[PDB]
Amino acid sequence: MNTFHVDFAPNTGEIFAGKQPGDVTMFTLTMGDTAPHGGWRLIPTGDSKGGYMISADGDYVGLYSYMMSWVGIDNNWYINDDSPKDIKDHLYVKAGTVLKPTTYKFTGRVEEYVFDNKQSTVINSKDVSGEVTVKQGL
Ligand SMILES: OC[C@H]1O[C@@H](O[C@H]2[C@H](O)[C@@H](O)[C@@H](O)O[C@@H]2CO)[C@H](O)[C@@H](O)[C@H]1O
C-alpha cells in the first residue's frame, strides 16, 4: 500500500576541487514510513559497490553516513528505527578528502524491513542514484 517515502538528492551548493577543509555532504537521503517497520538499509549497486562514489576520471571516493552504520560484510549501511518520523541522513566525504574538478556518481538501492523473531524481511525498496559535478578550486 503506500506511506513509504524515500528521497535521494545530490548536494545543491558548490563543491570545489581539492582537499576539502571539512566534512562535505555529497547526498541527502530522507526516509520515512508511518506504517510499522523495523529499519532501513542502503545497498550500493554497480561501481558504487562497497560505499563509493565513482568519478568520470575513474577514481573511487568512499562515502560516510551520519545516521547509519556501515557493514562491509553485507555491503550496506543500516539503521534500526521503529519510528513514524523521518530520518534525515547525509552521505558525506571527510575533512581532507581530495576531490577533482569532475563528475562523481553513486547508485544504490534502499530497503525498508521488519523483524520477525528476529530476522529481517524487506517490505519496501527503491533504486537511488545521483551525481555531483565538482568545480575547479582552490
Ligand atoms: O539489525 C538488522 C541489521 O543487521 C545487520 O547485520 C549484522 C550487523 O553487523 C550487526 O548489527 C550485528 O549485530 O550482526 C548483524 C547480523 O545479521 C545487517 O547488515 C542490516 O542490513 C540489518 O539487517
Ligand SMILES: *S(=O)(=O)c1ccc(CCN)cc1
Ligand atoms: S574503501 O575501503 O576506502 C571504503 C570506502 C567507503 C566505505 C563506506 C564508509 N564507511 C567503506 C569502505
Ligand SMILES: [Cl-]
Ligand atoms: Cl559510514
